[PDB]
From a paper:
Membrane-bound pyrophosphatases (mPPases) facilitate the transport of protons and/or sodium ions across membranes while catalysing the breakdown of pyrophosphate (PPi), a by-product generated in various cellular synthetic reactions – into inorganic phosphate (Pi). Similarly, VrPPase has been solved in multiple states, including IDP-bound (VrPPase:IDP), single phosphate-bound (VrPPase:Pi), two phosphates bound (VrPPase:2Pi), and different mutations at the hydrophobic gate. These structures show that mPPases are homodimeric enzymes, with each monomer consisting of 16 and, as found in sequence databases, occasionally 17 transmembrane helices (TMHs), organised into two concentric rings: the inner ring (TMH5–6, 11–12, and 15–16) and the outer ring (TMH1–4, 7–10, and 13–14). Each monomer consists of four regions: a hydrolytic centre, a coupling funnel, an ion gate, and an exit channel. Here, we solved two TmPPase structures in complex with ETD and zoledronate (ZLD) and monitored their conformational ensemble using DEER spectroscopy in solution.
In contrast to the TmPPase:ETD structure, the TmPPase:ZLD structure adopts a partially closed conformation. The overall structure is more similar to the IDP-bound structure (RMSD/Cα of 0.760 Å) than the resting-state structure (RMSD/Cα of 2.32 Å). However, compared to the IDP-bound structure, the TmPPase:ZLD structure exhibits noticeable movements in three of six inner ring helices (TMH11, 12, and 15) and seven of ten outer ring helices (TMH1–4 and 7–9). These movements extend outwards from the hydrolytic centre, leaving it only partially closed. A cross-sectional view confirms this observation, showing the tunnel extending from the hydrolytic centre to the enzyme surface, unlike in the IDP-bound structure, where it is closed. This is because ZLD is sterically bulkier than IDP due to the presence of the heteroaryl group, which points towards TMH11, 12, and 15 on the cytoplasmic side. Although the hydrolytic centre of TmPPase:ZLD is more open, the coordination of the Mg4ZLD complex with the active site residues closely resembles that of Mg5IDP in the IDP-bound structure. ZLD is nonetheless positioned about 1.0 Å above IDP because the steric bulk prevents it from sitting deeper into the hydrolytic centre. However, unlike the IDP-bound structure, and even though the arrangement of TMHs in the ion gate is almost identical, we did not observe any density for a Na+ in the TmPPase:ZLD structure despite its higher resolution (i.e. 3.26 Å compared to 3.5 Å for the IDP-bound structure). In the TmPPase:ZLD structure, D70316.46 and K70716.50 are oriented relatively similarly to the Na+ binding position in the TmPPase:IDP structure, but no Na+ density was observed despite the higher resolution compared to the TmPPase:IDP structure (3.26 Å compared to 3.5 Å for the IDP-bound structure).
Numbering used by the authors:
A (entry chain A): 2 to 30, 32 to 726
B (entry chain B): 2 to 33, 36 to 267, 275 to 726
The structure:
Amino acid sequence: YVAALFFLIPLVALGFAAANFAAVVRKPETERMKEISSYIRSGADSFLAHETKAIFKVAIVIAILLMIFTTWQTGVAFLLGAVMSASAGIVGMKMATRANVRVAEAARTTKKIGPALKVAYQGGSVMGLSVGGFALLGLVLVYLIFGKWMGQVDNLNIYTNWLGINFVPFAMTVSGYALGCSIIAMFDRVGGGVYTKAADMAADLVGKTELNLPEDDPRNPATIADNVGDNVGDVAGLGADLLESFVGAIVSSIILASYMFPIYVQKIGENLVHQVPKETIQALISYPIFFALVGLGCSMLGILYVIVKKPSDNPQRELNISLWTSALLTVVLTAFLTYFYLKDLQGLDVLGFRFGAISPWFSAIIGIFSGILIGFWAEYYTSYRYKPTQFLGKSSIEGTGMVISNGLSLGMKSVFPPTLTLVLGILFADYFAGLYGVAIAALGMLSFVATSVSVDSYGPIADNAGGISEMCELDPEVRKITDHLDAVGNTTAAIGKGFAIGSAIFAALSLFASYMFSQISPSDIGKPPSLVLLLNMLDARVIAGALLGAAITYYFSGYLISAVTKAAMKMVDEIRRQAREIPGLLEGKAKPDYNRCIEITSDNALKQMGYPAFIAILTPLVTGFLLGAEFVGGVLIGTVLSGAMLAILTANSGGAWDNAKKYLEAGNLEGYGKGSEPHKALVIGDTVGDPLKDTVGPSLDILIKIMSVVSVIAVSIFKHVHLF
Amino acid sequence: YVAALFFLIPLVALGFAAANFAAVVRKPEGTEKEISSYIRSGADSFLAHETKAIFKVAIVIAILLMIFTTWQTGVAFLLGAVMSASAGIVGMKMATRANVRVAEAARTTKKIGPALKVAYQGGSVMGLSVGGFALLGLVLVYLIFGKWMGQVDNLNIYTNWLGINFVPFAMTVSGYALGCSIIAMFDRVGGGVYTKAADMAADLVGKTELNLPEDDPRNPATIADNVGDNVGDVAGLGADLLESFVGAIVSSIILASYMFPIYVVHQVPKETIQALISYPIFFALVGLGCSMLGILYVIVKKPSDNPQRELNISLWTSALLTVVLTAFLTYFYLKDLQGLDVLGFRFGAISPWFSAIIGIFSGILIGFWAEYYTSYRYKPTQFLGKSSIEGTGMVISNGLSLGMKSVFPPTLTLVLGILFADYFAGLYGVAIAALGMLSFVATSVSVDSYGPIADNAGGISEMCELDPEVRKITDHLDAVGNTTAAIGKGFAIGSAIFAALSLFASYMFSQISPSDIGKPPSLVLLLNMLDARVIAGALLGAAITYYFSGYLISAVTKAAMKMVDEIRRQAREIPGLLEGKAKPDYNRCIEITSDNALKQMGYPAFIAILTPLVTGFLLGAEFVGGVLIGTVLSGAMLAILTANSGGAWDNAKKYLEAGNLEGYGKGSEPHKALVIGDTVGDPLKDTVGPSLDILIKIMSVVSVIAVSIFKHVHLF
Ligand SMILES: O=P(O)(O)C(O)(Cn1ccnc1)P(=O)(O)O
Ligand SMILES: O=P(O)(O)C(O)(Cn1ccnc1)P(=O)(O)O
Ligand SMILES: [Mg+2]
Ligand SMILES: [Mg+2]
Ligand SMILES: [Mg+2]
Ligand SMILES: [Mg+2]
Ligand SMILES: [Mg+2]
Ligand SMILES: [Mg+2]
Ligand SMILES: [Mg+2]
Ligand SMILES: [Mg+2]
């Protein structure tokens, strides 16, 4: 049976990632290189172990609560998704820590971009296969065990658990899975981002501007902290976040299809004429899973060809060819799959398939194209090759104040072009296949999460390799090879963040729909969807909730930035004290103390990482129990809008600042060099952008999805338990 | 009849402002007055050019309105535009004339009292001008078109040629508010761009690069800084706040006018609708009278203990008097009406008074939060300042974090206020509270303008070698003033949010046609946010607000970069300027800033005007409503954040300058980082922040005016 092969696909992805990891094992690693690799891996492993222990304790608590109030299988799937996210993060962290020194040694010996690009892509591919395989494995496991083995997909009827809980079985199970994935991603990424960005700000600022020392200089006591933070915050958090986004895209369609069946009914003399055939509903539920499986398989084939493919001097050319080929093949195979799976079905027109069975494929096509433009728009704004980043670089001569003001404008201006792309994508998907197609586009925009995760992971390995080169005092040319891979990596990371936020926006609209559906009760089960899908924004409660949600998102970003700044200030103080008190460090005859900086950042991150996830979880609950369901819908809408805007702005502005600093550093500016005051302004801009790109930017989509899932899960009790 | 007295009230405000201007126009002269004349000439030239451009564009817009809509709409448009322009220019002239007088008084007396009196008199002239002009234009329109012409008597939805369904007096007041808003937007954009660009360039080049004192005469941009303060923070302030006051009034006026035809067999007696339409005008008149009484008591009384103390005492007394008189007015005027429950008056005739009180208290809480977040007397600004020791990047990051965090308390206050206001009086309450939050705009205008005058005094003190105590007193007053500016911006954004909700209501009402006149109001008040078009429009509106802020910042930064380059070149090439024995070329800096401002002032207003038309003609009315919601949210957030963060940076820089940090003084590297933070916040404080509420209201007004045509005339 081919269903067995498609379900085994994710295990094949995991096996291929393991094979690539083995291929990267036994590669040539110097004794100092091996020592630095062991140090970085030990630091990252310790931090990740502490973070994972805390996160899984909290996850056990959350799972017990979910099992109590909601279906026990809901908590079981929550644990499944949480373990999936944690495993993806740990795998990525280990792969990066192992491959940084391998890529550095390759770049040092061959002196050619080919081998280093090959090794770094092997690491990124291992991580991407881990992400995709874990996501799809957990999702298909939930599907089979709870819907197929337990038959939760067969019932598809609204139940009432004790305490007055109105739920759908498979809906609750998949929602719990997505919620676990999102919680684990939130905790991991928050911790890693705080750590890495604080270390980066302190180290880069103190070394570049105050000590006049090179970047990632071994003399700098914060270099190890910066490298380990890159390994943890931008490598493990990256995988967690992207796996969570993939699972959310799939799960939005899953819940929408599940709710579609029992809701589309007609009351007739108190006889409830069911309006949609169950077979069609099951086909629509399985469609997104099979589509994600096809995307994962196509990404696997593309990555295999790339690893076997001819190496190119420019890594960007190979990355672009790989993603283009994988996307085209996925689109074609998905067209065929969508036609065959939904061919000659019944009820599609009723659920919004105006064109027909192929209408979800048209919506998925809209998602892929919309994402491509969002990435392109990000590239123009964040790349020095394009005009805007160059103007920011030219702004260096005028001063730090001009650089900061110019960067802020580029980010605020940057939001409009992608947002128009998203607005057009949403409208066309609704025209092509209603809300189900909205969710299908959310999924399609991230259909090939494996390749994007692979490239984004490929970046950090090159960064950590570059840091190893300066500390180990390797030849300047080898460092130059590492820098070339990192310059493309920064822009590709911004593109990935844009993809994530777009898929999150689509899935969040579909989750608004699912929430409005969840607001229904058995006595009100016969309402027409027109009355169910109504959220009047003239209701004072709805608009008040929208305002409160936007404000909550803004304060959340502010608190993240505050954590990063506190850590970075502590680090700057420690670096100044070490430089003043320790003799011989600036001359190179003394070895500073990095453990103090590592401890400062680790403690601050582990202490401050918990509160934001708790906020994101409890805000919907408290707001709903206080002001009802309409206020919660308004809060969700405001959060979605504010999060999209702020994520786009922060990612683009941080990338622009960093790329302008690299532009000046590369020597493309006329007359001004590393020690110039304009370079100090670029360093200040890059430090300001460090938290914005990898701390505030990525967390916003996770917050949106987690909040929407919490609301859809808990709306049943808070409609009648509203205090006011 | 007392109606005559209430209509004369605005003339009383104008007469009292003129009397104050004449009394303080004594303008005591000092050592060469020449520099004051120079600054006044520059400011007047810039304002004249700006006004010429704005009035050309206004004539074009008025012709278009008269053609497509009722000519009375364009006439009221011109009336409101002229009112706002007169307020702005009057305030700018008064400040430019009284800055040197107050500075000389403060120098001679060596005491804060006399300078406080003169500066508060200037602010009072400005605030009385704003309030009196608003109420004069409003009562004139009311009387001429609704009372004498009987537009209040008709109260029926009409359909003029081309298929526009409108209400007469509603359209007239909409045109009035739209004209005021266009003029305010243009004036504030120009003045803010000019002033903030000059300030950024001067501070960076002098303090960080040249190591020169603030407002040093050797610096060729100091004159530019003072004149820009006069243009952006003296005229723009009045334009923007007068526009906010007029918008608060007109929102309630329009909602009430649409209700009588929409509610249907008429559910609400016409007398009740006319009474509710006339109520907000009399309420604003009473508020203006109370503000005048408070300003009179303050100006006649002896000097206050603290400059903040006098402003707060005046505001408290005015608010209490307004509350009492408004209670009496609301009871007497609406006591014997009927059908007040149908429109939303849960408690009865006193519901609008409760909603206005809720709005006033929400504004007071917003001010409390602003004072908490933007004053160095409290914890957050102190932490931001201490962040300077950790570098400039740390200062910037902490400032951004503080700004983003400050948005929460005010937003929660606004949520509670919206909820409570709806409970007492419905959406009419949301609008009456929008007005109540700004019931005493005169005193707020006075206090807000008082800051810039003290700033100009400090700049002039540095320009002409003067005793240190003079500039110390002026800087003290200016330190108090910046927080007052932030509190005023908070008041403005809150009133804008309330009026924007009421405008959503009026917009949904306007979407009705004569053939669809019988629909139940419950079905009319629906704007489904699950409609893909509505949410897409919300996203696009948020993006439009963000790109608008980005364009403002880009214009300001380009102008400031050109200015910084010119100042650096002047300092490097001219010998003896840094040695203190020379004098540079200020005219070049002034010309650069003025040219850039005049070139960049047009695009943002055109965006704010055309966004609704294009979005509606492209996607329909639901998309336009979504764009309105997205714009409202994004603008509220961005305005609050920018204002609060800029105020925090500036107050932390003053904290370090005052010597409150241990061991680190003026000219220190941490002080350089603090100056960089304040300069980065400069455009955010007075250019991007205030423009957002004007953008929201202008966009909502344009949409409400043209919703009828695009509701069914949509290309897609
Ligand atoms: O991870 P980050 O963005 O901090 C950094 O990697 C940015 N970067 C450097 C070159 N390309 C991007 P670095 O710490 O090397 O300054
Ligand atoms: O233009 P602003 O109001 O920010 C300013 O007046 C701020 N300030 C100065 C003293 N007290 C407040 P200056 O540019 O003179 O630094
Ligand atoms: Mg860096
Ligand atoms: Mg790095
Ligand atoms: Mg580094
Ligand atoms: Mg960086
Ligand atoms: Mg300043
Ligand atoms: Mg000034
Ligand atoms: Mg000044
Ligand atoms: Mg300033």
